[model samples]
Target: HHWGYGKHNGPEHWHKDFPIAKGERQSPVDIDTHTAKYDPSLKPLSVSYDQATSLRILNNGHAFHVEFDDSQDKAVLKGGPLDGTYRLIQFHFHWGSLDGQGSEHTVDKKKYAAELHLVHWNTKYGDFGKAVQQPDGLAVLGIFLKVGSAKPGLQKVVDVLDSIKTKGKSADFTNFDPRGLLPESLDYWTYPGSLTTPPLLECVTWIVLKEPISVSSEQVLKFRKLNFNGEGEPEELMVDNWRPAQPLKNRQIKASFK
Candidate 1:
């Protein structure tokens, strides 16, 4: 069965293929800042992305992923909602066709133009695949996108989009710092959530940035240009590829900054 962001195979029907879609804890919840508790004990996220660690940029069936070499601790996330270090595996995005409705996680029912996800796996699990199913096995750092000034740091990435425009397509990516892609404020809101994609594993500790990064409307549109389907298959627009916000259930959102 084909599962995608299209109306027929979208989030509403994901439960058919992956029953965990409707589990107790799901992802991309509507975070009400007013309700979030400020935790003075939460440490600031420690990130160090070595440009040399970036391996390739490829178009996966779901989204374009900038993959990294996780064989070592070259690029790891620590200090925020994590006990041990988590290796940086890859990063991807979810976007909408139009502004004000794209980001998967909305703040007080408000959406951004898009959202970026930096996926990491806990070292305790040994590998990313194994970590996907273990508790606290994943830590996804989410950065919201908005239409404004163009970010030069992101342009290098956009410059290579055309090279890997089709699924299964991959291009070399290096000399790039993923940390430069982040917003000024490291202030974040965290909660337990799922992958928002199939298998929808309930293992992610989501750390969402309070401030959004700027990318021109043009740069944001470039993300939609890539096709979701691979070569020799029917082309599908990749826009609005984000999953709908799920119920908070019994989770409490913790704020790292006052």
Candidate 2:
């Protein structure tokens, strides 16, 4: 069986299959705001998104992700901690079974209800596969989600989960703008880290926004409807699919503002 967020196959067991799981740059770190250094030199991030870039949404049994057409720079991220333009490839979320937990990256050890990851790849590395193996090949923007007012943009994505409830299922998802999901502030914390998932390569430059966006409790309940197991297999709800925070280990977290 593959790695999963189960008592027997969770994050603790990941290192068994992927040795890099205990590497120096593992992700989903706790951002101790007190220790974060203010870097006035850090520029505001520039995000240029195209409504036509969103292609489809898929449930890979791990998490449900919305894929984008990254053939060109239709949707790209620049400035900030990134050295050059990184093409938007896909976006996904990690949530909890309860509102009390679920965020991968914690702030002051406080966990949000969920976390969103917008994954991108550096054009300098040629393609995503090649980029995943390079130190500075990927940039993933993380946005925390706390329960509050409803979010229309998030509801749009949630409405489609029914079509892809089981693992390995996907459906057409187009003309969606993810920018609406972001909070009002662009102020953020930057650090070098790896993907929270398996093969946990330390290629990502994490840009975690300081402010969190609001998502209604109802939205989270809909996400719980998804299944980690395939349709024919024994059904298992996809919940608490987030990795716990890793040690900092020789890395400095820089902020874009004071």
Candidate 3:
């Protein structure tokens, strides 16, 4: 069965095809901050981005992502519950149709307008394909987006939405520095989790930021205009693309800040 946010194939039915959807350490979990333990040993996140490596932006039907040149460590993410350097592959967003709710991972059951996932792969495994299968393969930096003043960094991405409005569409998007999208504070919550999307692989190490960046409600509306269907297919607005919060099970959430 096709997986989507529709009632027929939404998160409720994902376990049918991908049993791992119900597996331990599933992602986009609700973080009960009250229960989160502060770890003094958790290092601050180290990030370095080279504008020259920002490649293209594409609509993969589920979400629009700005992919980078992961051929080398031109852009990398390290520290913060990680052992070694990981290459930045791509970054994408999951937003709601409205301003009140959209983020996948919640804090104390409080939702944000959206969430940005920065996907990275471990160098120890050589490449993303090989790394994704390993337990310590990937690290995804999750930054929440709350509705407020307009964010110039997010506006750069919004400016390109008109070109790749449908699934499988792409455009040359270069010189974009993703770090501009980050909030002032890097304090975060870390946990072991899956991709949040199928194959629902139990491979990702989630580092979700405690602070959120600001975006205008208008900017979020632009995200909805991106169609899940490409040309000649049935039209479907790409809204509510986020997977709902999953069970925490036996996992413990560690906070980088007190």
**TM, every model:** 0.97, 0.98, 0.98
lDDT string for model 1 (79-156, tens) is 978899999999988889898778999999999999999999999999998999887999999999999999988998
**Candidate 2 vs candidate 3: which has greater lDDT?**
2
Q: 197-255, model 3: which lDDT tens digit per residue?
A: 88999999999999999888788989988998887888899998899999999999999
Residue 182 local lDDT, model 2? 83
What tens digits encode model 2's per-residue C-alpha lDDT throughout 88-200?
Answer: 99999999999989999999999999999999999998899999999999999999999989998888998999999999999999888988888899999999999999999
Looking at model 3, which ten-residue stretch has the lowest summed lDDT?
46-55
For candidate 3, list the clashing residue pairs, or say none.
none
Candidate 1 clashing pairs, residues 3+ apart or interchain: none
**Higher lDDT: candidate 1 or 2?**
2
Q: How many pairs in model 3 have backbone atoms within 3 A of each other, for residues 3 or more apart or on separate chains, i.e. clashes?
A: 0
TM-score leaderboard ranking:
2, 3, 1
Candidate 3, lDDT over the whole model: 0.91
Clashing residue pairs, candidate 2?
none
lDDT of 1: 0.89
